[PDB]
Amino acid sequence: YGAAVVNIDLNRDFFDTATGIDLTKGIPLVQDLLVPIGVTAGAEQSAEY
Amino acid sequence: KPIIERQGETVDGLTIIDTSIVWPILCQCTYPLVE
């Protein structure tokens, strides 16, 4: 009695945080698979989606 | 007095173009690979 919001997403258990994936935001974010070759330092932070 | 003439080689490296400068730029040359 007092639940503000419920929802559905990716299970933070089958997709463990240790290997392969991470979920702090709604988007399942891994680190380095497709990094833009020739850009600035602040870029490629979206290509990890 | 012409602008371009046949004289060569001058005492400068601006005559006789070396054609062997092709193999080093295909192998022993790392580019920025595209910081």
UniProtKB/TrEMBL annotation, chain B:
What species was this sequence derived from? Bombyx mori cytoplasmic polyhedrosis virus (BmCPV)
What protein am I looking at? VP1
Q: Signal peptide location in the record? A: none
Give the residues of the full protein shown.
742 to 790 of 1333
